[PDB]
């Protein structure tokens, strides 16, 4: 479960 | 299969 | 401006 | 003189959950609403004292729940999706299915029309995104890097300069696809529940996603970065941006929360007039939202087969 919003290209 | 050509008018005809 | 810019503006 | 919303009236006639609402800029007096009664009602907005609107036509071709409905830019056609796994293109003049889109093996959950109406995209419970032309031919099927769970919402970006498709799913991921090559462009993580809806601002620069976890996250579509998270407090069933104001409307549970994007504050919370009944049943859930062409009217669909109409009234302090 994610804790912080992280986005990858 | 390769991605369809968006600019291609016969591949993606207009809606009419 | 843009909608993203509006969110970026501090309160 | 803070802007407020009031209940102007309800649209009656559906026999199932109003699942989606569509409006067109060309026809201010016409809206479409999908439903679980397997039909789409085309309404006539009479704005009379007795009824705000009455059903004018019914699109009866789907054999299961209608999930999504969108009107064309010209306003003469309406694309629709269903749990029967097929899409239908409707001629709104005669109410007949011009074309059928086949190829999805599970329930179709979302359909979208391109800005120029020359492309169609759909998401289905078979975990795939399909791209069609207007002739019913599936030009491409996105299975590489696609969602690992149901694809619940697929949208196009109104900005032609940025030809992207936003897609959410039950795998708690927001995916941005480059329409030029139908390849993954960005992968936004951060949701702790399954996603139900994604909406894109009228300028194609901001995306809002929401669902089970009750949080409406805003992602920049120009830069692919998370911006803000708004606490809905309940399952987000629909998301919408106001066409003229910097507002985000979320159908969180039985109520609709409107957020001023500038101040990250709630402008209004649209709760139904709960009767003082002894019933312990949960109030109807708002499952759809749609703003009118001028942005002064908001249509909301509920699980009690109704389409409540909310007006942007200038509320003097």
């Amino acid at each position: 479960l994610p804790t912080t919003p992280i986005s990858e290209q | 299969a390769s991605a369809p050509d968006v600019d291609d008018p016969e591949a993606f005809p207009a809606l009419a | 401006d843009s909608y993203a810019a509006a969110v970026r503006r501090p309160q | 003189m803070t802007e407020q919303m009031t209940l102007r009236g309800t649209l009656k006639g559906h026999n199932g959950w109003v699942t989606q609402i569509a409006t067109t800029p060309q026809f201010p007096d016409m809206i479409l609403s999908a439903s679980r009664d397997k039909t789409i009602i085309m309404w006539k907005l009479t704005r009379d004292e007795t009824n705000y609107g009455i059903p004018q036509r019914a699109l009866r071709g789907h054999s299961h729940f209608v999930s999504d409905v969108v009107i064309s830019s010209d306003g003469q056609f309406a694309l629709s999706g269903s749990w029967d796994g097929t899409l239908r293109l409707w001629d709104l003049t005669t109410g007949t299915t011009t074309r059928r889109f086949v190829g999805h093996t599970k329930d179709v959950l979302s359909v979208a029309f391109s800005s120029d109406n020359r492309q169609i995209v759909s998401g289905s419970r078979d975990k795939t995104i399909k791209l069609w032309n207007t002739l019913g031919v599936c030009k491409y099927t996105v299975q590489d890097e696609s969602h690992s769970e149901w694809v619940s919402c697929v949208r196009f970006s109104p900005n032609s300069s940025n030809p992207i498709i936003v897609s959410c799913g039950w795998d708690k991921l927001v995916k941005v696809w480059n329409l030029a090559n139908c390849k993954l462009k960005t992968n936004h993580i951060g949701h702790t529940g399954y996603l139900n809806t994604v909406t894109v601002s009228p300028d194609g620069s901001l995306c809002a996603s929401g669902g089970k976890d009750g949080q409406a996250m805003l992602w920049d579509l120009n830069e692919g970065k998370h911006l803000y998270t708004l606490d809905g407090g309940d399952i987000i069933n629909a998301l919408c941006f106001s066409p003229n104001r910097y507002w985000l409307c979320a159908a969180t549970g039985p109520s609709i929360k409107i957020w001023d994007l500038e101040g990250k504050i709630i402008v209004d919370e649209l709760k139904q007039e709960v009767i003082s009944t002894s019933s312990k049943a949960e109030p109807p859930q708002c499952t759809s939202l749609a703003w009118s062409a001028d942005g002064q009217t908001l249509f909301a669909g509920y699980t009690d087969n109704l389409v409540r109409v909310w007006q942007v009234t200038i509320g003097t302090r």
Side-chain angles (χ1 to χ4, degrees):
Chain A
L1 263 206
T3 81
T4 190
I6 36 178
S7 51
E8 57 267 357
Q9 312 311 79
Chain B
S2 64
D5 253 19
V6 163
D7 314 301
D8 193 0
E10 314 54 34
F12 283 95
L15 173 58
Chain C
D1 297 354
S2 48
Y3 273 59
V7 176
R8 258 158 182 164
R9 300 183 217 183
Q11 323 179 9
Chain D
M1 282 214 178
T2 55
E3 283 180 298
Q4 198 215 0
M5 323 274 308
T6 59
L7 197 51
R8 283 291 151 241
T10 89
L11 313 181
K12 192 171 182 178
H14 266 322
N15 225 29
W17 295 6
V18 175
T19 58
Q20 185 58 287
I21 308 183
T23 71
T24 166
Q26 302 271 321
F27 295 104
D29 302 0
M30 186 252 281
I31 74 163
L32 303 167
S33 67
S35 182
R36 290 199 157 186
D37 57 20
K38 295 131 94 197
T39 81
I40 313 167
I41 290 181
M42 181 196 311
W43 305 86
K44 184 72 201 163
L45 299 185
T46 74
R47 255 93 72 159
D48 210 281
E49 303 185 0
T50 57
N51 310 316
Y52 195 92
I54 54 129
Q56 180 89 90
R57 188 170 282 286
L59 320 174
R60 273 184 249 280
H62 282 297
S63 57
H64 216 298
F65 298 158
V66 189
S67 308
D68 209 0
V69 60
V70 287
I71 321 185
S72 276
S73 59
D74 44 285
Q76 327 258 29
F77 294 91
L79 171 82
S80 153
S82 184
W83 286 29
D84 56 54
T86 64
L87 298 69
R88 283 187 177 244
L89 190 65
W90 304 87
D91 182 77
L92 293 188
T93 320
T94 65
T96 53
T97 292
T98 299
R99 215 150 291 280
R100 294 204 338 135
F101 302 73
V102 186
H104 271 319
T105 70
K106 294 240 175 33
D107 322 320
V108 165
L109 293 184
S110 198
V111 298
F113 249 140
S114 193
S115 34
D116 79 354
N117 279 192
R118 284 161 151 290
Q119 284 140 109
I120 293 170
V121 84
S122 67
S124 173
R125 267 173 176 142
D126 62 356
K127 283 129 78 139
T128 191
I129 300 172
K130 286 200 199 265
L131 189 104
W132 324 70
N133 62 357
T134 40
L135 290 183
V137 186
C138 183
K139 295 321 270 163
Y140 197 82
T141 303
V142 174
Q143 302 178 1
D144 297 353
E145 305 166 298
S146 190
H147 297 266
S148 33
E149 302 309 310
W150 303 338
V151 177
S152 41
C153 192
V154 284
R155 292 297 176 244
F156 274 97
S157 174
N159 191 7
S160 59
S161 304
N162 202 6
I164 64 134
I165 286 137
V166 188
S167 175
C168 82
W170 280 46
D171 64 347
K172 330 181 184 53
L173 287 164
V174 173
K175 294 176 180 294
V176 180
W177 315 85
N178 179 232
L179 174 63
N181 58 10
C182 285
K183 254 162 61 153
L184 192 64
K185 184 183 140 103
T186 319
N187 203 338
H188 302 279
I189 331 176
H191 280 275
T192 62
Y194 61 75
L195 288 167
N196 263 327
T197 170
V198 279
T199 190
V200 182
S201 34
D203 51 11
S205 66
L206 192 87
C207 163
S209 47
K212 173 79 157 211
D213 57 306
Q215 309 297 301
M217 325 211 160
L218 312 174
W219 320 84
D220 199 358
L221 294 183
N222 308 328
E223 301 192 58
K225 190 75 209 103
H226 180 260
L227 287 197
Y228 197 84
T229 301
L230 304 147
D231 191 10
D234 218 330
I235 304 184
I236 304 183
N237 302 299
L239 280 163
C240 213
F241 283 109
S242 191
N244 50 0
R245 314 181 202 71
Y246 294 101
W247 284 2
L248 177 71
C249 298
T252 53
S255 170
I256 314 161
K257 267 141 169 144
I258 311 187
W259 281 290
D260 207 284
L261 299 182
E262 275 211 290
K264 322 299 184 308
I265 50 159
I266 280 189
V267 191
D268 209 330
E269 164 133 57
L270 311 196
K271 315 179 183 181
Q272 336 168 11
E273 296 187 359
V274 176
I275 327 181
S276 59
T277 58
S278 60
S279 63
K280 310 174 183 178
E282 246 269 358
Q285 306 292 296
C286 191
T287 83
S288 33
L289 287 174
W291 278 101
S292 59
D294 55 5
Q296 313 286 313
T297 309
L298 178 75
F299 308 93
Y302 295 77
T303 63
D304 70 331
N305 324 327
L306 254 67
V307 182
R308 289 173 179 70
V309 169
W310 305 90
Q311 193 65 50
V312 173
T313 84
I314 310 183
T316 66
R317 303 177 184 181

